[PDB]
Every structure is written in structure tokens, then in C-alpha cells.
Amino acid sequence: TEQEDVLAKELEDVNKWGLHVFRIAELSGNRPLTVIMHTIFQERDLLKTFKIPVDTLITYLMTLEDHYHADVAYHNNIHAADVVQSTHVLLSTPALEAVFTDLEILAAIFASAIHDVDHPGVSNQFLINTNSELALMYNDSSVLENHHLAVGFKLLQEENCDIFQNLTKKQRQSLRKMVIDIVLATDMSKHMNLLADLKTMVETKKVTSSGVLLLDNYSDRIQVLQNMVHCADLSNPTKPLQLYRQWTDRIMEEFFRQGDRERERGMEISPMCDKHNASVEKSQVGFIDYIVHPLWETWADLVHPDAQDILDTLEDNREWYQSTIP
Ligand SMILES: CC(C)CC(=O)c1ccc(OC(F)F)c(O[C@@H]2CCOC2)c1
Ligand SMILES: [Mg+2]
Ligand SMILES: [Mg+2]
Ligand SMILES: [Zn+2]
């Protein structure tokens, strides 16, 4: 109960950017995804709203969590938990108050939970280049992201795992489509097009009498949710530095392990995957400059000024990593 009370204490920070997610992973007995999802569902009253039996939720979450690979350094259950919690915070931004329905909120959070499930710790390109069963199944197109969806949905049909059992047929249909649209948008090959569309929305932005975003069609609604979960997926450099550095340690380990597999096969080693020739700090600065900051700056514009502190942290972290280079 002492460890249980300390875990309960930590989970009180679930509405905050910079939650101690690694501490939660250890305190929960390597069940960060389960406890964070359960906490968020309680916080948002989702069990009552969708008549989700508590035991069904926990059973599904435990099985979902099990299907993340404990031996993968970055794309594991802790990352899933982190993206879920980050999405949860982004959904609560003042500029979006009362914009999304309960079903849309459920879709975004569920999509976040399943978005990397059964990740093998290697990239789409590696899977394509090595003629893997996954690339063959999915015809080289969003290979992993299709797989994550397939696994996430299939696990609902396991014993006592259908958390959506009390949704209407129309609700289930809508949720399934939304979840697919969201998880496929986490494929980095879609990033530039997603960002271009987000910029267009920002430039043509409309707000209600309340000062909240006006979204009156599926296309705009789903686009915001896609970019939201994508922002959450790309949120590591916006977190307090002690968290960001741990995420960087993990992605580099994962990248280096892929590079070792490429080396052992006699393949050319992918960018940033050679442990004997890798500039970790320069690569983080490039990652921020070319990908993460352009996205988060546009998100910040969409919800201005709600995300200013997040954007400020990102800029501080870029400066920090940059400062280690000279
Ligand atoms: C979805 C995608 C961005 C996940 C990913 O590959 C990734 C996540 C966090 C990354 O870094 C840090 F945020 F943990 C990351 O960095 C690589 C290594 C240097 O630049 C690119 C990459
Ligand atoms: Mg596992
Ligand atoms: Mg992914
Ligand atoms: Zn991810």
C-alpha cells in the first residue's frame, strides 16, 4: 500500500505536461499504460458515458500493454502511456473547450493507446528493405501503422476485452473510422502534408463567440485530432529536460540496435543508426529545427496562446542541445 499510495500521488499529475511517466512505470509494476489510461478514463467520466465495465477496461488495457515489446528501448508501453497522457492534456486546451464530442475524445485517447502496439523496434523502411512479412502483408504502405491498428482492434475480441460493447452500431462505426484516420496520420511519411494542412487551417482559422475553435465538418475535425495525436507523438523535445534526455537515450539505443542488424546483414546503415558514427546532439537539433518546432509552432498558433509554455520549453531544449555542440 505504500508503493500504491506513492503511485496514487504521482497519478494526481495526470493533467500536467511533464508527468513523471518513468516513475509511474516503475511504481505501477511496469503498467504505466494501464494505470494512466484507467486514471484518464475516470477523470473524463468515460466509463459511465460509454457504459464500459471496469473489469473489461482493465482486461483490455493489460492485454494491449502486454503487446508492446518490453525489450524495445523507445517504442514500448512507456511511450504509449506518454502519448496517451500528452494527448489527454492537449484535449483539455482552453481553445478547444467543448469542441469535440465524447466519442471523438474517446477515439483520440484510444488511438493514442494503440498507436505503436507490437512495434518491433525498427522503421518502416527497414521492414521494406529486408522483405519482412509485415512489408509484404501491407504492400510497403504505412506498414507499422496498419499493423498497430490491426493489433489494437483485434485485441478487443479477446475474452472480456470489448471495451466498446455498449456503444451503438453507429458509434462503433464512427469510432473505428476515426481511430484508423488518427493512427495512420502518425506515419512520418504523412508529416509534411499534415503540417501543410494545419498551416492552412491556422491561416483560415475561425473562432466562436466563446473564443473557441470552430470546426463544422469531419474533414477539419479529424485533421485537428490527427495533428493533436501527432504532436503528442512528437512531444518529447517539448518536455522538461530530464524527461527529454531519457527519451533521446532510448530512441538512440533503438536506432543503434537497428543499425547493428543492418550491419550484420551487410546493408548500408540508416542515418543516425551507426553507433560508431552518430552525432546525437546535432541530430536532436536537426530533429527540432526541421520537424518538431515547425509542427509545434503551428499547433501553438492554432490554439494561441494556450501552448506558449510548451513552445518555450521546446526552444529552451533546442538551445540546450545546441550548446553542447561547440
Ligand atoms: C514518430 C517518430 C518521430 C519517432 C522517432 O523516430 C523519434 C522519436 C524521438 C526522437 O528523439 C527524442 F525526442 F527522443 C527521435 O530522434 C531521432 C534521432 C535524432 O533525430 C531523430 C526520433
Ligand atoms: Mg510485450
Ligand atoms: Mg509509430
Ligand atoms: Zn509513437
From Swiss-Prot:
Tissue: Expressed in colonic epithelial cells (at protein level). Widespread; most abundant in skeletal muscle.
Residues holding Mn(2+): D116
Effect of substituting D140R: Abolishes homodimerization
Binding site for 3',5'-cyclic AMP: H75, Q284, F287
Post-translational modifications: Long isoforms that share a conserved PKA phosphorylation site in the N-terminus are activated by PKA through phosphorylation. Isoform 3 and isoform 7 are activated by phosphorylation (in vitro), but not isoform 6. Sumoylation of long isoforms by PIAS4 augments their activation by PKA phosphorylation and represses their inhibition by ERK phosphorylation.
Binding site for Mg(2+): D116
Binding site for AMP: H75, D116, D233, N236, Q284, F287
Active site: H75 (proton donor)
Subcellular location(s) per record: Apical cell membrane; Cytoplasm; Membrane; Cytoplasm, Cytoskeleton
Binding site for Zn(2+) 1: H79, H115, D116, D233
Domain PDEase: 1-326
Binding residue positions for Zn(2+) 2: D116
Associated pathology: Genetic variations in PDE4D might be associated with susceptibility to stroke. PubMed:17006457 states that association with stroke has to be considered with caution.
Biological function: Hydrolyzes the second messenger cAMP, which is a key regulator of many important physiological processes.
Similarity comment: family membership: Belongs to the cyclic nucleotide phosphodiesterase family. PDE4 subfamily.
Record text on subunit structure and interactions: Homodimer for the long isoforms. Isoforms with truncated N-termini are monomeric. Isoform 3 is part of a ternary complex containing PRKAR2A, PRKAR2B and AKAP9. Interacts with PDE4DIP. Identified in a complex composed of RYR1, PDE4D, PKA, FKBP1A and protein phosphatase 1 (PP1). Isoform 5, isoform N3 and isoform 12 bind RACK1 via their unique N-terminus. Binds ARRB2. Interacts (via N-terminal region) with SHANK2 (via proline-rich region); the interaction is increased in a PKA-dependent manner.
Identification of the protein by name: 3',5'-cyclic-AMP phosphodiesterase 4D
Species of the source: Homo sapiens (Human)
Complete-protein stretch covered: 388 to 713 of 809
